[PDB]
DNA sequence: TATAACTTCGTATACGTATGTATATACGAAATTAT
DNA sequence: ATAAATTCGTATAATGTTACGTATACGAAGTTAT
DNA sequence: TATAACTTCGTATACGTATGTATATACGAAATTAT
DNA sequence: ATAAATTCGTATAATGTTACGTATACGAAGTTAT
């Protein structure tokens, strides 16, 4: 099978298009630490075995690693062998025996998920105080993206793509835009978040001074130097990474600078505007699958798990004890 | 394995009626396009080698086919292969990553699904003050069959399979269809469609004027030739094509022609009343379970999709950050 | 293994305990059938050939019988095959693209279930204007019967093992009753349907003339020959049959006497008082889920099947439509 | 696979890890009794006999264990067998039969599951009425405990692993435990178990006289010697038979000694308040949806089990009847 | 000083879940380009 | 002979669950800071 | 008498379900027992 | 040199779907009682 296993890899490369781009740098970045490994401990590395990947596993849980990391490591393997015709680790007892034990021991010795920090209207009120006046270029984008974001729980990668075409003007005063969301067959062309009568006035003092308006092409957001001058592009988006760092820095501004420890969830993220909303719609009392649609939400565990600790979606045994 | 293949080919044909009609209509379609594409490049047509499929479905794609039917083209193929002992052609690699491949192509360039152009109770309430006057036969049919369709979300093929017989009146005086064939298959008596006051008046009126109760095994719905008589009959039944073509004319005639785009969707086809009932039961409130009900869905994917768009934005969070 | 088959049977003989003997009644029959089938065409009956069974099946198809039990005599023929050690018929092509075809083609041939006749309050208060007057003890004994079950929602086989002292007295000058009703660990060993006022003095006057009073273990409802003269038993219970008939002759007394056609479902039934009951309490509008507790019932379709010619369980679109 | 079967059952204890201490607490448990019967018979330990390990479960019903048990030493007698590579005894119609019998003629017999003493609100407002006003530190406790378990429905193992790093406040001021341990496996962040402020206060009593808080990594509840000294911990937790023998002696307290019946659930359990909270909210509306939240439960037929028993009767089919 | 309050233990029995992968966000960090 | 059932055969409607663990129930013996 | 109103057809594409068995009721009919 | 990002590696949270049919969409040719 030595030549069905050189075919299947032909047949991964041929049709690399069938994943996407950073799906497959996971991958790469799994062969990779699995390799290094087997090399440091003289050990094949493809094919895995079964012992050897049980030894692997057995590490990353040392190495302080989360289950669904260690799981995702197994995972790219398993696949990795299963679409190159040979076994997959997990289809041994010894992995499958130490999967169950990592699992069930990390559970207990208390390993908690990634919560993610909330960017609510008091935290944009506080900053819409404190950047309001600035007459820097860099304020005034970061307030409009802080605006579009909370007002429109929309994700990083879909506001960096959207182009200043993208958005126009109804119901008032107000704006309206309206993105992809969604992409498989199945899903809606496109909806409209329309941005509200304090957030419209953002982004317009952001178009104004960046000039992103010259080009109905050009992205609404773009790039502005130290010298304060935008960089309008209808070819190049703002990097996602660049919109989070809007978010930690403005948080910086704001709560010191983060704290020694890397304890991961310190200031705010890319979602942190999404998390934020979500809560403050549910504390005005608004029906979960009312919030579910502003997010494009469709799990309702999830959206459960950003506004459970806020006293109102308290449970029924709450209610029924206090009267 | 090579005459157990041929039995196996007879004995899927000799209890062929195990099958839709439509099935082995779409079966034998697609093997005329496939053996067509392999006779062009001179290749063995059956069975299928994985590297010609692959070739094949990006001839397909290259064609400009939708993704939905590229996989019906892998769908038959696989078929007949598995019903014939062989292995099919998606236990490739080759097939599988290309199948995947296309989908992203496809759907990261803009293409989307297409549904029915909507019929809700405006358009219902439109055409029936236009027709409700109408003495002809062909007017008091339509109308009614427009109803039908709108009032039970029925699809055109199990209007077009109602029975006088099949017909029933409740205690409020209300109609009654009940459908006999459902595809959730144990022994789900079926379900049995009530229609409203004002719409069992135009099944009334139409049966009155078409005397299709002089055998109550004769169909609902038949045919009303050029001299406005009524055609009735218990061996064959109002072609879907026919139910199509009212909904097609009810269109044409409050809107005219539609242009000559080609695009699909441009008036009204059998399924209208369905996608608009379920908007106008969501936009009115009515619990999901209800709706599914109404429809006879056994999920939730299709009737979500048939809504998102309307209460999408307005208020919400813009309310919320004004006052 | 012929010795295996033989130790197989001697297995499940063996244990035969482990299934209701009604159930194995079942299988003797389908046995008996097919067996018999074989000796007239010919052909091996244990074990079955796929061929065999496929036959068979097209004859039961012709024989007019409905696809519920065409499947379940190919059941009792598969679990005979598979406890048996053999391969069982269902797991041919041959027979499984059969029972396809057949399901499907009797589907579309307009295959409707077996409804059942409703006892409701209209017919058990034109009964009891009939049959209350009367001094004859078998009057009596069916009128009580027809409240007891009208008015519990209980199953014939369950009011048939009830006991004088299973019924005790509170809430007034109301009655008690408490049976089994489920049995297999999880289940509710047993429950208190409760007889109304009107109800409770037809029960009363059937064991102040019957007499079953005279031993607590007795059962409630008795034997009663021509003579007029009750026979109370804590050994033997009155046959369900019997009580069925108590439903027929009812309806006989009434509505004439049957009719000619085998069609049926033409008078009452065992479970005509369930069906009716569960009508009049959605006509009186009662939550669908409080339905199902009056009649120990957990599958809300049953239940959905007997009130959906309702016309209150209407639906939505008529609500819709009628404003 | 005479050696393979070694190896394997080397890799389960290797890897133990991966199965819950109580699973393990229970196969050898079974194993010492299938083997004890096994040597006053002269048979065969392991590989278990399926003729064997049926006269064995036969054995069992006979000594009068229940069904769920008889079950269980089958269980492990299975997964013993599969977890080995050897093929289980229940793949055998002997022991398959056997148990489907035993299981009938049992429940037949009257046998049924048996469910905790429940702890409803009345329960939890009257012991709290009594030790609220004591200053005892073990009494505090109690107290605190039996709140939360009403309050969260929380199993003793979970409130058992409650560490004060877990504990937190909400927006109204109410405590929120957060239970890090959930079996419906992937990464459910967890349940933030909310307390009333009445329960809250019970805590924070506790919390205070008890000096738990001197390390947020110790056990929320710990013990209390006699002299009302508390011993907070971070390594070990109050043992659940502690916890178990808390709801013991709060219903001694109020009922006094138990009859020596022998019977269980003679007083409440450590599931007491989830049975009991169950039924609190059921009775008083709240959906069932609700419900399952509550208690964690992600199915339907155990909070139903619990409930069944009360809005029986009352009305329903009588007051309908009546008038 | 015997003792309250547990802890450990073993057999009996009730309670419960049932997915793995492709894709996007996190985020500290090295690389890049224009002030 | 026949009312009133009971027992039988079998079509057909309504009900109900398997597999593999994991956690609680509880009397009894051993532990420990008082 | 050409024609409204379909029917039949074939390729293109959207819509949809996913259980089988053990047990109880049906019910016409033969068997049974006491008036 | 450095603000402001972009590109990289990889831990980790959130999203999403396969298999096998079955039915509709619609322009175009053939059918038939007028």
Same mark, same amino acid.
């Given at each position: 099978t030595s030549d069905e296993v050189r075919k299947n890899l032909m047949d991964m490369f041929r049709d690399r298009q069938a994943?996407?781009?950073?799906?497959? /740098?996971?991958?790469? $970045?799994?062969?990779? $630490?699995?390799? #290094?490994?087997? /090399?440091?401990?003289?050990? /094949?590395?493809?094919?895995?075995?079964?012992?050897?990947?049980?030894?692997?596993?057995?590490? &990353?849980q040392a190495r302080?690693?989360?289950?669904?990391?260690? %799981?995702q490591h197994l995972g790219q393997l398993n696949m990795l062998h299963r679409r190159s015709g040979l076994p997959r680790p997990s289809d041994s007892n010894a992995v499958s025996l130490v999967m169950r034990r990592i699992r069930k021991e990390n559970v207990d010795?208390?390993? !908690?998920?990634? %919560?993610?920090?909330?960017?609510?209207?008091?935290?944009?009120?506080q900053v819409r105080s404190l950047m309001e006046n600035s007459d820097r270029c860099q304020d005034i984008r970061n307030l409009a993206f802080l605006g579009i974001a909370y007002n429109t729980l929309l994700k990083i990668a879909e506001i960096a793509r959207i182009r200043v075409k993208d958005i126009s003007r109804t119901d008032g005063g107000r704006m309206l835009i309206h993105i992809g969301r969604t992409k498989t067959l199945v899903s809606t062309a496109?909806?409209? /978040?329309? &941005?509200?009568?304090?957030?419209?006035?953002?982004?317009?003092?952001?178009?104004?001074? $960046?000039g992103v308006a010259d080009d109905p092409n050009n992205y609404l957001f773009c790039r502005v130097r130290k010298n304060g001058v935008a960089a309008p592009s209808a070819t190049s988006q703002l990097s996602?990474?660049?919109?989070?760092?809007?978010?930690?820095?403005?948080?910086?501004?704001?709560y010191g600078a983060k704290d020694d420890s890397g %304890?991961?969830? &310190? #200031?705010? $993220?890319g979602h942190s505007a999404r998390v934020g909303a979500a809560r403050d719609m #549910?504390? #005005?009392?608004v029906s979960?699958?009312?919030?579910?649609?502003?997010?494009?939400?469709?799990?309702?565990?999830?959206?459960?798990?950003?506004?459970?600790?806020?006293?109102?979606?308290?449970?029924?045994?709450? !209610? &029924?004890l206090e009267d």
């Open positions: 994943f996407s781009e950073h799906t497959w /740098k996971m991958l790469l $970045s799994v062969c990779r $630490s699995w390799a #290094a490994w087997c /090399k440091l401990n003289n050990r /094949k590395w493809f094919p895995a075995e079964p012992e050897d990947v049980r030894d692997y596993l057995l590490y &990353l302080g690693l989360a289950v669904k990391t260690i %799981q010795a208390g390993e !908690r998920a990634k %919560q993610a920090l909330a960017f609510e209207r008091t935290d944009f009120d496109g909806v409209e /978040k329309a &941005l509200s009568l304090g957030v419209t006035k953002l982004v317009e003092r952001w178009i104004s001074v $960046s996602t990474r660049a919109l989070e760092g809007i978010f930690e820095a403005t948080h910086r501004l704001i %304890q991961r969830y &310190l #200031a705010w $993220s #549910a504390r #005005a009392g979960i699958p009312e919030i579910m649609q502003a997010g494009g939400w469709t799990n309702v565990n999830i959206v459960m798990n950003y506004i459970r600790n806020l006293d109102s979606e308290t449970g029924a045994m709450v !209610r &029924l």
